[PDB]
RNA sequence: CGGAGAGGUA
DNA sequence: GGGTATTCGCCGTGTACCTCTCCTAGCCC
DNA sequence: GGGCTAATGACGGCGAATACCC
């Protein structure tokens, strides 16, 4: 709809922890789509709106963002580790399987927000049309 | 007839082959196929297998031999 | 009392019945260990099996012992059969690995 | 019999050994009442057993 | 009355209601309702006469009869008793005897 | 007898569940009650589970006995051998899905665990008392967490489409629809190459190793929430009236139609678009019966008339005690078998025992039938029959004969040892 | 002499137990079914050749079975010198003492140390005819290789409590000394004592927990001076109860108490016997506090003490310093800082639970634990069962291990060890070693390792049935039929007695063979 | 209903061990800790016992 | 021969 | 924080036989 | 008539879910 979408992108506060979850256990999900939420304004919402008057559909385009988003973080990790392996990176071998070196490795958090920032400015471009 | 298995058992040691091999022998020596070695008081074919296993006439060498003995002329 | 062939039940083909020819005797699993204490291993096979539940089993082994011999057939007891149907009536799954 | 019966609850150790007590109240028609101690000398209530 | 939650009458039959019955949101008139019965209506909680001089007989008391309800009195005197008993000037009542 | 080396355990599907199944049950009926004739397509019924009688149609119209390869064509019958009657299984198409009760109320609640919240939570929005949000949108609040009615509603009013919570097994079944473990499996892999704490680390092998255990038992979460539910054979679970007043039966009958008219009337009511409270009350009351009839006992209990005792379910006789019921205990009885008080013979040798005459005779008795059609003392079944009734002395030399060799094992009931 | 009296591996029949006994040998190491390595069964000689016949094991003998039931039926007839006070040898031989934390000082006093000291009486061979358990502190007239008559006190202590002997010379400093929290103020002095109480070991105060009081033995020039030959540090971390008896400024001499704990002379009743105590050693049920062990040797220390239950530092001389363990603070301990301790040294006293046995002081110790306590408990009854059936029992309890580092599991999968070493055989025979793969014992109870059975037929079908079903159906497992139970149900031959040879067949005629 | 169901179907509600009049005047002389408001039979109960 | 309760037995 | 330390449900319960009852009924159509 | 149709005086053990001093 609207030729210019406003974005809460690549901003240096958009670094917090996003641990938010309102029962037990803290891991994966419920924090993979306020991610990618929290790298949209408002204008995407009434956008998807006007675009899409089918609420299924909509949930179904959500379900798409969310599974886009989840594979560019794994690509962010795979890129991770390939860097740090051609860094110098040692497998480490810990009583929870493999991990790379302290110095190598990074966090989850930081490379989620990323793709959720460029995930975002992709759809932001997708509404450019 | 016989009432004590300590002669098969020395015989055949693991005794449990032995009841295989005795079964195998009362068999057909109930079902046609064969005649018993040891001669008969109207016994049943267990006790007749016993008495046989106990004088080393019949053990899993002599039964596996007459029976591809028996296969051999049976197919030709 | 003592029976050899006489009543079943409607569910399932252990013996019990009335008192004009009452069902075999308990064969509890008590006295199954006692027989797997023994090298008790075919005797197990025909109290449990031919002796117990499998009907064809029931029906051919009579067959044989009054044809003048005394063989069995293995057969697939019908109690393991209400069983494995009563677990898959709550949509759980039971198969066989067929050899 | 219907009545006030102090009866004592054995095999609460919690590696402290020490036997509790306990107060049951029983009519001849109605709810139970229950008095009870714990190991922290803290007297618990049970309507029935509730 | 530190470990205690709740400070006054309402909050009191409240938690009481609740924890009668799970769920069944609930209302100070129905919780008063409901202790009322449980404990001081004669259609719902009756000691009868064996009961009552069994009570009285327990808690040391001079009477041989009383009211089928439970009072006030009567659990304040469970209370005191229960604490001698902890105390050690009580005693515990056998379980199987006679009488 | 069939040739197996290995019994495979598996969750099921509702499609491999229809194929299960030769028929849909219906009819909440297993006979018409005053008449004992059984009702189609009810829990009984010649159609779905095949003849209750062997080798020919009940509708009236076949009665020869040429009808075993093929069904009847004359009506919806399927004909065959009686024993498929005990062998065929049914199902009945619930309208709303259905919980399986025994993934909720077991302390390792594997729903709860798979969706790593508790039971509590899972019991409330399934007893129709709380809302979940199912897969939201860019709502401030989780994407996955309880809410009750006040809130639900403030969310309700405060987003629109991109807000959906829904009530009862139909909820789960979303999140359980919504989860790919694969993906999960390699985003959990994929953040143990990054994460260095020990609590992170654990919890995401912990995951991981569930995950894992999901994918190699090749289940998808979907089938594990009941959409059909299949109903036993009638015949493992047989139809036995009481004369007078009474219609007692088997308890799974009754349970199986509670459920059914449960289901009939859900149907009814969302065929003609019932408001939404009585269509979720009639669907907590579905899920309470599918949950009794599984296993009475983690719902409340489900009592029969004249009889303060919960009916058997089909948890209730599949636990046993001591063990399952009918492989060996209890009971396993056997034929061939007797039993007698003991008398001391200390005339005996040490292989000997003495044992009644009657006893013998009605324990020996195929024996006693073939040796005596061998030997030619009889020329029928028939003959052995009167035979041994009669109890002739024809027969004690037979007796002699077939018990000459031929030992039996004496057993005590507590059995403590082997020599027992 | 290192002269051979008996064949290798052969079965020990009257004749070789007949020339034992006159070449008197005082043990014997036997293959046991616990130190079997055949997998997915017994191996014959690892059994033995108890049967109705003097002949060695048959091949095919279901003896589990057998040792299940030889284990019930005296179970019907299970219903429900002096110890700690002084050892008085009642025979005539040998002192001979094991295991020994001790020093000779003053007085020709042998003060033997901690509770881990044993004392045998060797007869005129090898043999051992009686056997006591030396306290921490005693006062021994005797030694290695002396005669001793009947009836005579070869090591004696006080019956109501147990003295602290000082091994070496010098004052006493009070160290970790606060006034009203670690100890209560009393003073009687006779002759130079005094009657200061530690506080009871449950909870002593705010600060007499966080800290723990000491007495330090030091020469008259304050150095340290230490205790060479014993693992008590010289500093006497005082436990509960321990009255301390010397006061600090006077010269103490060896063979004096220093702190006098009391005990209870014996009898304690923490003991139950029968059906029901048979029972929770096959469950291995907890007994009320055990008696935890040291689960690691070397020097240890208090950590921070008094964290609601106290952590106890263990750091090896060579191995992971920081190893802090857990302490309640309802127990008397025997070990304090600065001791030596090592696997299965006891860090409380009581009784021991099996899983603290088997994890740390091995797998030989603990089906030896098991296996004489269910003896004994069949002793009081005068009946008597051989140990292969008890030790086979054992063997069927501790199938599981968990994995520390894997080859194929997850680092935490609590997975059959029969498996675990077809794994790890399978991997080292193979030029390559992946990971690994490191595994410990773990004891399970007879309910838990039968529902932990690798088939969950027999598990299902005998125990509780709802929660094993659905775990294998959620779980998707499969199983090859194993065990003879299965079968039973399955309604096929047994793979044992009679049927081991046709089933064992069949498994020959499986993989196109 | 009621009463006819105390008479008929409770489980102190017995038929008369009826062979000796030593079996009649124990019966009825019986006294059954069990029943409804009292002990269970699987109990143990030692110290009941 | 669908299932509960009671007594007695070993 | 953490390790008890409770509180909340699930669960187990010798064997086998004999005898005996006693068996979904409410109800708005 | 009828077609649907709707507790404890257990005890010991044990896993799960919070509870509580230091």
Same mark, same amino acid.
């Given at each position: ?16 922890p996003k641990h938010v979850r309102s029962e037990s256990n803290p891991q994966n999900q419920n924090k993979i789509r306020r991610a990618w939420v929290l790298s949209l304004?408002?204008?995407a919402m009434?956008?998807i709106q006007?675009?899409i008057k089918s609420a299924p559909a909509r949930h179904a385009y959500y379900e798409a963002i969310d599974r886009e988003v989840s594979n560019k973080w794994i690509e962010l990790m795979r ?17 929870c399987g ?10 989850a958090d930081?490379r989620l927000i990323?793709a959720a920032?460029?995930v975002?400015?992709?759809i ?6 | ?76 | ?82 069983l494995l149907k009563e677990i898959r009536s709550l949509g759980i799954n039971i198969e066989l690995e067929?050899? | ?50 | ?21 799970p769920g ?76 | ?6 019994i495979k355990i598996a969750l099921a599907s509702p499609d491999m569940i229809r194929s299960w199944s030769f028929g849909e049950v219906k ?62 299984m049914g199902h009945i198409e619930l309208a709303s899905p259905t919980a399986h009760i025994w993934f909720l109320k077991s302390l390792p609640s594997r729903i709860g665990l798979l969706l790593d919240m508790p039971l509590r939570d899972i019991e409330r929005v399934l007893y129709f008392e709380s809302y979940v949000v199912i897969e939201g949108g860019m709502t401030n609040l989780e994407r996955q967490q309880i809410l009750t009615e006040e809130q639900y509603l403030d969310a309700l009013?405060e987003f629109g489409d991109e807000f959906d919570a829904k009530m009862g097994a139909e909820a789960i079944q979303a999140l359980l629809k919504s989860m790919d473990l694969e993906q999960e499996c390699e985003q959990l892999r994929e953040e143990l190459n990054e994460t260095?704490?020990?609590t992170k680390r654990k919890k995401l092998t912990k995951r991981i190793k569930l995950l894992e255990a999901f994918v190699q038992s090749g289940n998808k979460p979907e089938w594990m929430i009941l959409t059909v539910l299949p109903v036993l ?19 799974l009958?009754?349970l199986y139609?509670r459920v059914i008219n449960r289901n009939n009337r859900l149907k009814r009511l969302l065929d003609?678009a019932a408001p939404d409270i009585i269509v979720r009350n009639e669907k907590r009351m579905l899920q309470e019966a599918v949950d009794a009839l599984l296993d009475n006992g983690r719902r409340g209990?489900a ?10 379910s089909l948890a209730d006789?599949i636990k ?101 | ?408 599991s997850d680092f935490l999968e609590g997975e ?35 529902l932990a059975?690798?088939s969950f037929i027999?598990a299902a079908?005998?125990?509780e049935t709802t929660r094993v079903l659905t775990e294998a159906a959620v779980a998707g497992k499969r199983d ?34 | ?7 008929? =179907? ?13 079996? #009649? ?6 006294? =059954? ?13 030692? #110290?009941?016992?």
């Amino acid at each position: 709809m609207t030729k210019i979408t406003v974005n809460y992108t690549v901003d240096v506060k958009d670094i917090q922890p996003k641990h938010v979850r309102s029962e037990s256990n803290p891991q994966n999900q419920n924090k993979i789509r306020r991610a990618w939420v929290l790298s949209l304004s408002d204008n995407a919402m009434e956008v998807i709106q006007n675009k899409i008057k089918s609420a299924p559909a909509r949930h179904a385009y959500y379900e798409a963002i969310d599974r886009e988003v989840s594979n560019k973080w794994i690509e962010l990790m795979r890129k991770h580790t390939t860097e740090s392996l051609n860094a110098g990176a040692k497998f480490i071998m810990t009583s929870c399987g493999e991990r790379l070196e302290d110095d190598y490795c990074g966090n989850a958090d930081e490379r989620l927000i990323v793709a959720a920032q460029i995930v975002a400015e992709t759809i932001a471009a997708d509404f450019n049309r | 007839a016989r009432v004590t298995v300590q002669d098969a058992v020395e015989k055949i040691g693991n005794r449990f082959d032995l009841v295989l091999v005795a079964a195998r022998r009362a068999r057909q020596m109930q079902v046609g196929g064969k005649d018993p070695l040891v001669p008969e008081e109207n016994d049943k074919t267990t006790v007749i297998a016993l008495r046989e296993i106990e004088e080393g006439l019949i053990n899993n060498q002599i039964l596996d031999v007459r029976e591809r003995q028996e296969q051999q002329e049976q197919e030709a | 009392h003592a029976r050899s062939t006489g009543s079943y039940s409607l569910v399932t083909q252990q013996p019990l019945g009335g008192k004009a020819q009452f069902g075999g005797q308990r064969f509890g699993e008590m006295e199954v260990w006692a027989l797997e204490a023994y090298g008790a291993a075919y005797t197990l096979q025909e109290m449990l099996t031919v002796k117990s539940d499998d009907v064809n089993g029931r029906t051919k082994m009579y067959k044989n012992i009054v044809d003048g011999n005394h063989q069995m057939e293995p057969g697939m007891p019908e109690s393991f059969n209400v069983l494995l149907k009563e677990i898959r009536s709550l949509g759980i799954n039971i198969e066989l690995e067929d050899e | 019999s219907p009545g006030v019966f102090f009866d004592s609850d054995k095999g609460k150790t919690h590696s402290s050994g020490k036997v509790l007590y306990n107060a049951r109240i029983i009519p001849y028609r109605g709810s139970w009442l229950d008095f009870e101690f714990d190991p922290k000398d803290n007297l618990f209530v049970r309507i029935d057993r509730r | 009355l530190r470990v205690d939650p709740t400070n006054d009458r309402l909050s009191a039959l409240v938690e009481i209601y609740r924890m009668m019955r799970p769920g069944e949101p609930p209302t100070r008139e129905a919780a008063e309702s409901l202790f009322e019965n449980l404990f001081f209506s004669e259609d719902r909680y009756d000691l009868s006469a064996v009961g009552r001089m069994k009570f009285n007989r327990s808690l040391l008391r001079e009477e041989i009869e009383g009211s089928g309800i439970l009072s006030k009195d009567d659990i304040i005197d469970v209370m005191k008793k229960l604490i001698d008993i902890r105390n050690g000037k009580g005693e515990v009542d056998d379980i199987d005897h006679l009488g | 007898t069939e040739e197996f080396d290995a019994i495979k355990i598996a969750l099921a599907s509702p499609d491999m569940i229809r194929s299960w199944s030769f028929g849909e049950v219906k009819k909440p009926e297993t006979i018409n009650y005053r008449t004992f004739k059984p009702e189609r397509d009810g829990l009984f019924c010649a159609r779905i589970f095949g003849p209750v009688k062997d080798y020919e149609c009940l509708c009236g119209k076949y009665k020869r006995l040429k009808h075993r390869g093929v069904i009847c064509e004359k009506c919806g019958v399927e004909v065959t051998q009686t024993k498929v009657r005990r062998e065929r299984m049914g199902h009945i198409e619930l309208a709303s899905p259905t919980a399986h009760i025994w993934f909720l109320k077991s302390l390792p609640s594997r729903i709860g665990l798979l969706l790593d919240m508790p039971l509590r939570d899972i019991e409330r929005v399934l007893y129709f008392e709380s809302y979940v949000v199912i897969e939201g949108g860019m709502t401030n609040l989780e994407r996955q967490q309880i809410l009750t009615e006040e809130q639900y509603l403030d969310a309700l009013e405060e987003f629109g489409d991109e807000f959906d919570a829904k009530m009862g097994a139909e909820a789960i079944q979303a999140l359980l629809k919504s989860m790919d473990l694969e993906q999960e499996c390699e985003q959990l892999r994929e953040e143990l190459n990054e994460t260095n704490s020990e609590t992170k680390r654990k919890k995401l092998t912990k995951r991981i190793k569930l995950l894992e255990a999901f994918v190699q038992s090749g289940n998808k979460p979907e089938w594990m929430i009941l959409t059909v539910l299949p109903v036993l054979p009638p015949d493992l679970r047989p139809l036995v009236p009481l004369d007078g007043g009474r219609f007692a039966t088997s308890d799974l009958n009754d349970l199986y139609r509670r459920v059914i008219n449960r289901n009939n009337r859900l149907k009814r009511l969302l065929d003609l678009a019932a408001p939404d409270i009585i269509v979720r009350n009639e669907k907590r009351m579905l899920q309470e019966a599918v949950d009794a009839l599984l296993d009475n006992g983690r719902r409340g209990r489900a009592i029969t008339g004249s009889n303060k005792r919960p009916l058997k379910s089909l948890a209730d006789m599949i636990k046993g005690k001591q063990g399952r019921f009918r492989q060996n205990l209890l009971g396993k009885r056997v034929d061939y078998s007797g039993r007698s008080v003991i008398t001391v013979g200390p005339y005996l040798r040490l292989h000997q025992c003495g044992l009644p005459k009657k006893m013998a005779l009605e324990l020996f008795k195929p024996f006693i039938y073939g040796k005596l059609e061998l030997r030619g003392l009889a020329t029928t079944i028939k003959a052995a029959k009167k035979m041994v009734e009669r109890e002739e002395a024809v027969v004690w030399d037979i007796l002699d004969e077939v018990i000459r060799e031929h030992p039996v094992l004496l057993n005590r009931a507590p059995t403590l040892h082997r020599l027992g | 002499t290192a002269d051979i009296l008996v064949p290798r591996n052969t079965l020990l029949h009257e004749q070789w137990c007949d020339l034992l006994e006159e070449n008197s040998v005082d043990a014997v190491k036997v293959r046991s079914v616990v130190s079997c390595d055949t997998d997915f069964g017994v191996c014959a000689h690892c059994y033995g050749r108890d049967l109705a016949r003097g002949h060695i094991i048959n091949k095919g003998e279901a003896i589990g079975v057998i040792a299940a039931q030889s284990i019930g039926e005296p179970g019907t007839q299970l219903t429900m010198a002096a110890a700690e006070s002084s050892i008085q040898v009642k025979n005539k031989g040998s002192i001979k003492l094991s295991n020994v934390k001790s020093v000779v000082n003053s007085s020709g006093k042998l003060v033997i140390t901690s509770r881990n000291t044993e004392l045998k009486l060797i007869d005129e061979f090898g043999r051992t005819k009686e056997s006591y358990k030396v306290p921490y502190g005693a006062v021994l007239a005797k030694g290695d290789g002396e005669q001793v008559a009947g009836g005579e006190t070869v090591a004696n202590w006080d019956p109501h409590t147990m003295p602290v002997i000082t091994e070496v010379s010098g004052f006493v400093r009070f160290t970790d000394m606060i006034d009203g929290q670690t100890i209560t103020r009393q003073t009687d002095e006779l002759t130079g004592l005094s009657s200061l109480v530690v506080l009871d070991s449950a909870e002593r105060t705010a600060g007499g927990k966080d800290l723990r009081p000491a007495l330090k033995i030091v020469d008259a020039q304050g150095n340290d001076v230490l205790i060479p030959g014993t693992d008590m540090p010289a500093q006497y971390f005082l436990p509960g109860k321990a009255i301390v008896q010397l006061e600090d400024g006077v010269q103490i001499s060896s063979g004096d108490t220093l702190a006098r704990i009391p005990q209870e002379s014996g009898g304690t009743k923490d003991i139950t016997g029968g059906l029901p105590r048979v029972a929770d050693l096959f469950e291995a049920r907890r007994p009320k506090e055990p008696a935890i062990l040291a689960e690691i040797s070397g020097i240890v220390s208090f950590g921070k003490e008094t964290k609601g239950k106290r952590r106890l530092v263990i750091t090896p001389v060579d191995g992971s310093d920081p190893y802090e363990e857990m302490i309640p603070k309802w127990r008397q301990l025997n070990v304090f800082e600065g001791e030596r301790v090592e696997r299965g040294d006891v860090i409380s006293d009581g009784p021991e639970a099996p899983h603290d046995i088997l994890r740390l002081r091995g797998v030989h110790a603990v089906t030896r634990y098991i296996v004489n306590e269910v003896q004994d408990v069949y002793r009081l009854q005068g009946v008597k069962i051989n140990d292969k059936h008890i030790e086979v029992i054992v063997r069927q309890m501790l199938r599981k291990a968990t994995i520390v580092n894997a080859g194929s599991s997850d680092f935490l999968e609590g997975e059959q060890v029969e498996y675990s070493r077809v794994k790890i055989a399978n991997r080292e025979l193979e030029a390559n070693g992946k990971v690994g793969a490191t595994y410990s014992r773990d004891l399970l109870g007879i309910t838990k390792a039968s529902l932990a059975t690798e088939s969950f037929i027999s598990a299902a079908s005998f125990q509780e049935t709802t929660r094993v079903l659905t775990e294998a159906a959620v779980a998707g497992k499969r199983d090859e039929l194993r065990g003879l139970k299965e079968n039973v149900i399955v309604g096929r031959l047994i793979p044992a007695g009679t049927g081991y040879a046709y089933h064992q067949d069949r498994m020959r005629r499986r993989a196109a063979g | 209903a009621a009463v006819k169901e105390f008479f008929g =179907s409770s489980q102190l509600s017995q038929f008369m061990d009826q062979n000796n009049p030593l079996s #009649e005047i124990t019966h009825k002389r019986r006294i =059954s800790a069990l029943g409804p408001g009292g002990l269970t039979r699987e109990r143990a109960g030692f #110290e009941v016992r």
